[PDB]
Amino acid sequence: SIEKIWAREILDSRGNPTVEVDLYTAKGLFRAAVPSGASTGIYEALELRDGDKQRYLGKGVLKAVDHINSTIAPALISSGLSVVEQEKLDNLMLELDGTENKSKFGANAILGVSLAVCKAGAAERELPLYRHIAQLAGNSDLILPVPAFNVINGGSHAGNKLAMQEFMILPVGAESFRDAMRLGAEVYHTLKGVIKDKYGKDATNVGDEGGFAPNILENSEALELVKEAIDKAGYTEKIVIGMDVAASEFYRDGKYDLDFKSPTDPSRYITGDQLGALYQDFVRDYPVVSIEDPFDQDDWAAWSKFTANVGIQIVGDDLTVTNPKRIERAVEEKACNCLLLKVNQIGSVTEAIQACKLAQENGWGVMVSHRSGETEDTFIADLVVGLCTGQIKTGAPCRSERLAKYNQLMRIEEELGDEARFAGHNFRNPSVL
Amino acid sequence: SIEKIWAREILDSRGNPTVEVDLYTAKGLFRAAVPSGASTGIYEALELRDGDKQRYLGKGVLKAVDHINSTIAPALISSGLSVVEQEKLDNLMLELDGTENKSKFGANAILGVSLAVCKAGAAERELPLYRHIAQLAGNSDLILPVPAFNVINGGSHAGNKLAMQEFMILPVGAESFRDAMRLGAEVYHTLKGVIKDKYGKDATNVGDEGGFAPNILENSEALELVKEAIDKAGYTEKIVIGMDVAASEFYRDGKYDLDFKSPTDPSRYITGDQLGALYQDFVRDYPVVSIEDPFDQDDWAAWSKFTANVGIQIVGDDLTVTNPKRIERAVEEKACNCLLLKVNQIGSVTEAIQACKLAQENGWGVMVSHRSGETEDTFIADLVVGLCTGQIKTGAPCRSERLAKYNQLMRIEEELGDEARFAGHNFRNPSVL
Numbered sequence: 001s002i003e004k005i006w007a008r009e010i011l012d013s014r015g016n017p018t019v020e021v022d023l024y025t026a027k028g029l030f031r032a033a034v035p036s037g038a039s040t041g042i043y044e045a046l047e048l049r050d051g052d053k054q055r056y057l058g059k060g061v062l063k064a065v066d067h068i069n070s071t072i073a074p075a076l077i078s079s080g081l082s083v084v085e086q087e088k089l090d091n092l093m094l095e096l097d098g099t100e101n102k103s104k105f106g107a108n109a110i111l112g113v114s115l116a117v118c119k120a121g122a123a124e125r126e127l128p129l130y131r132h133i134a135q136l137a138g139n140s141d142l143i144l145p146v147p148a149f150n151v152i153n154g155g156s157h158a159g160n161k162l163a164m165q166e167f168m169i170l171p172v173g174a175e176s177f178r179d180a181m182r183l184g185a186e187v188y189h190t191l192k193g194v195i196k197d198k199y200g201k202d203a204t205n206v207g208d209e210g211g212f213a214p215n216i217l218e219n220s221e222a223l224e225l226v227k228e229a230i231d232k233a234g235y236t237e238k239i240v241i242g243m244d245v246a247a248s249e250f251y252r253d254g255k256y257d258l259d260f261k262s263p264t265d266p267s268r269y270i271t272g273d274q275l276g277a278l279y280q281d282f283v284r285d286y287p288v289v290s291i292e293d294p295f296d297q298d299d300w301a302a303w304s305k306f307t308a309n310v311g312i313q314i315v316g317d318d319l320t321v322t323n324p325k326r327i328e329r330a331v332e333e334k335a336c337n338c339l340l341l342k343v344n345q346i347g348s349v350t351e352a353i354q355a356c357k358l359a360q361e362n363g364w365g366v367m368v369s370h371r372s373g374e375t376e377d378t379f380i381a382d383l384v385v386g387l388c389t390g391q392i393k394t395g396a397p398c399r400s401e402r403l404a405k406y407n408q409l410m411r412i413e414e415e416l417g418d419e420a421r422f423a424g425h426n427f428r429n430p431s432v433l
Numbered sequence: 434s435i436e437k438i439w440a441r442e443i444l445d446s447r448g449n450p451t452v453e454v455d456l457y458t459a460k461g462l463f464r465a466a467v468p469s470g471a472s473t474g475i476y477e478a479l480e481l482r483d484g485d486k487q488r489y490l491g492k493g494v495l496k497a498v499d500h501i502n503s504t505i506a507p508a509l510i511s512s513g514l515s516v517v518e519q520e521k522l523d524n525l526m527l528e529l530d531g532t533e534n535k536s537k538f539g540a541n542a543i544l545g546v547s548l549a550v551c552k553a554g555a556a557e558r559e560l561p562l563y564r565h566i567a568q569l570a571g572n573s574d575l576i577l578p579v580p581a582f583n584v585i586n587g588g589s590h591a592g593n594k595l596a597m598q599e600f601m602i603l604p605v606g607a608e609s610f611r612d613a614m615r616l617g618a619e620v621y622h623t624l625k626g627v628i629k630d631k632y633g634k635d636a637t638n639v640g641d642e643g644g645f646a647p648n649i650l651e652n653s654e655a656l657e658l659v660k661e662a663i664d665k666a667g668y669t670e671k672i673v674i675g676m677d678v679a680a681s682e683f684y685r686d687g688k689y690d691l692d693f694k695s696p697t698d699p700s701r702y703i704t705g706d707q708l709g710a711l712y713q714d715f716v717r718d719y720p721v722v723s724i725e726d727p728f729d730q731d732d733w734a735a736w737s738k739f740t741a742n743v744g745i746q747i748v749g750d751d752l753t754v755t756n757p758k759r760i761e762r763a764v765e766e767k768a769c770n771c772l773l774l775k776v777n778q779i780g781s782v783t784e785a786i787q788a789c790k791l792a793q794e795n796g797w798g799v800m801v802s803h804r805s806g807e808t809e810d811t812f813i814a815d816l817v818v819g820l821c822t823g824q825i826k827t828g829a830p831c832r833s834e835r836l837a838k839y840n841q842l843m844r845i846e847e848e849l850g851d852e853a854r855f856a857g858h859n860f861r862n863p864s865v866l
């Protein structure tokens with residue numbers, strides 16, 4: 001049923017090129033765009049950039065766009081497949097690319113088309129996108145997720161010394177998704193005033209994901225500021241904390257650097273055991289219920305040891321790269337107990353859905369995620385509701401590449417009406433609701 | 434006619450509630466959202482907020498949403514007017530409100546519906562939105578504007594001592610709108626590095642509009658950084674500078690305070706004459722081609738004297754508030770020569786089109802503008818092309834409430850094909866194309 005495919009370069013939320021795809025059927029135009037990370041795992045599917053150093057500092061995506069327009073488009077048009085056939089269309093692309101890591105076309109070329117196909121397929125079925133994704137995944141009973149808002153940005157997403165990437169608030173005690181937005185926004189605005197009072201107005205500019213970027217160094221101080229703002233806002237009993245350490249970003253010679261944005265000094269490196277003990281303190285002193293990428297993507301022993309010794313959610317991101325092969329190993333080694341789901345780590349909607357179901361079948365949580373370079377696309381709002389995962393991270397409640405998803409989640413909750421169920425304290429396993 | 438209107442509260446780009454409207458006709462669903470300013474002029478149409486200090490810090494828009502759903506929607510549906518009848522539908526809302534400044538329903542209520550009507554009207558006409566806007570305005574040409582990107586900020590809501598609000602770059606020498614985006618993005622990334630080298634990583638997080646706020650007091654230092662970045666990027670021949678001083682934010686006792694964020698000391702206040710002489714130095718020393726709000730919104734004498742003594746573009750924003758009554762005065766007094774067009778300073782599409790036509794009929798330029806609180810809505814991209822104004826300011830090339838509009842302008846340039854014309858060096862007077 002595909003009539004025409006046309007891709008172009010747009011700019012993402014950091015001002016870098018990315019791929020957008022228009023796909024036409026008899027039902028109209030369906031448009032999707034692809035996100036892009038900065039703290040990208042070494043095992044992610046290849047993001048194809050042009051490397052023309054004069055043009056966009058080598059970050060153009062004209063090669064991927066030309067792959068879609070000149071090669072992928074006719075191939076899918078020639079297949080005569082309906083756009084409801086997500087798996088057959090995705091398989092066609094994966095086979096035409098022919099490499100393990102989508103390095104011929106780029107994962108960004110293939111994903112852009114895969115997302116546009118899924119939106120077209122929804123229209124073909126006369127279904128909202130979240131319901132079409134539920135059907136693809138084999139789910140019936142949809143769930144609005146707890147949002148995890150990154151309200152202090154550090155690591156590779158902000159100009160400060162703060163090494164850990166993300167400090168998030170999860171309004172598990174909210175009444176609804178729309179009430180979760182109010183809780184998160186109120187804590188965020190209260191947090192601004194906490195930071196301004198303590199560190200001055202000049203500490204309240206934001207990092208790449210909209211979280212404030214105060215020029216602090218201690219990760220316990222970020223946790224302190226977040227706990228203060230939750231309490232000041234009146235929500236101690238309703239809002240808990242999650243972290244994405246992104247420890248691969250500061251992994252240095254078998255050790256870890258908590259001042260990695262400062263000129264090098266190997267004497268400050270701590271070991272993985274020292275790092276884990278610091279996490280145990282955070283878990284004891286603050287309401288931390290989830291830690292993502294606490295150790296490097298290859299540091300398997302540290303992950304399996306930490307996971308065995310805590311009762312909280314431990315999330316694979318650069319460890320697992322939304323990749324069934326790496327997920328199978330993490331399940332076997334009990335490396336973690338939740339998968340961060342990033343469609344662009346693996347490069348297709350079908351593979352991402354496969355990765356989600358593999359985690360869920362092994363009793364893991366799944367947290368759908370944005371990338372730090374996002375667009376105005378809102379696909380992952382419909383994806384998290386259709387996959388019924390119960391949790392999504394897609395930014396602070398600041399910068400509309402983040403709010404576009406949160407706003408779409410409010411619209412979905414509205415659409416579902418009395419059938420809406422919010423994951424609340426069952427964010428790790430919302431199936432019980 | 435209109436089948437259904439439904440409003441809701443969504444979050445804008447700073448995490449504050451704003452109005453979104455869904456409007457249904459036999460052609461389907463049309464959705465629009467309303468932006469919000471921070472440096473708002475005293476003559477703007479009223480933005481209605483709920484003022485419940487316990488909910489969203491007083492900034493809810495439940496009252497505006499209720500005026501739409503309980504009052505405006507049934508009245509417009511009762512009318513039977515076709516959504517092509519922009520002027521009659523807007524007049525109906527204006528009459529039901531009955532106040533000069535839209536303070537019964539809120540300019541935010543009325544505008545939300547006005548924008549959604551306009552989108553549905555384009556679909557009724559089987560036209561893209563930019564062409565429907567051009568027909569509403571009586572234009573049969575279409576022009577892609579030069580974008581003005583806000584890259585360094587100061588002003589009343591930034592934590593540096595820098596008094597002036599915005600320093601913008603304009604790629605007037607670009608080959609196309611898509612090429613303007615590349616020039617803007619490359620210079621913005623170059624500036625980040627220039628700031629990092631001079632002020633430290635800690636100075637490179639971003640403000641509400643995606644620009645940087647290093648800790649500087651001297652406005653000339655902002656200009657110097659921007660000029661260094663343009664030069665370092667290789668684009669000295671193709672990029673010029675615009676400023677938004679927002680002088681109403683620092684007017685004090687009949688004078689002006691360029692260190693207004695340090696504790697009050699009237700001994701440092703300068704006259705409007707002193708401030709005008711400073712602008713003359715900027716224009717001599719830097720490629721400044723446009724200054725917006727160089728004096729207070731009531732300091733008519735300074736505006737007329739300055740505009741008579743320079744050749745640059747002088748933009749009314751808080752002076753004119755997209756308001757035909759104020760614009761008539763400014764034309765008669767020769768207070769300025771360009772109008773900044775903000776649909777939500779006046780509150781309806783019809784009135785904003787009348788404001789643009791009044792400026793253009795009197796020989797002024799018009800620069801379409803975002804607000805500092807934006808959403809994923811991209812109406813103003815179609816608006817600037819349909820009104821053929823040649824200039825738009827809608828953010829740094831960072832944060833997707835800004836890039837949504839720039840990306841949409843790239844899409845329109847693509848849609849126009851061989852017929853696309855870029856205002857380039859004719860941005861002040863594009864009608865010569």
Ligand SMILES: O=C[C@@H](OP(=O)(O)O)C(=O)O
Nearest residue numbers: 037038039040370371372
């Ligand atoms: O918050 C998103 C991520 O950042 P990115 O990898 O897209 O830079 C992450 O590491 O989880």
Ligand SMILES: C[C@@H](OP(=O)(O)O)C(=O)O
Nearest residue numbers: 470471472473750804805
């Ligand atoms: C960009 C805009 O800021 P605000 O929307 O805060 O008035 C302006 O003053 O021109």
Ligand SMILES: [Mg+2]
Nearest residue numbers: 037039040246
């Ligand atoms: Mg990462």
Ligand SMILES: [Mg+2]
Nearest residue numbers: 244246293317
């Ligand atoms: Mg991560």
Ligand SMILES: [Mg+2]
Nearest residue numbers: 470471472473
């Ligand atoms: Mg203003």
Ligand SMILES: [Mg+2]
Nearest residue numbers: 677679725750
């Ligand atoms: Mg202004």
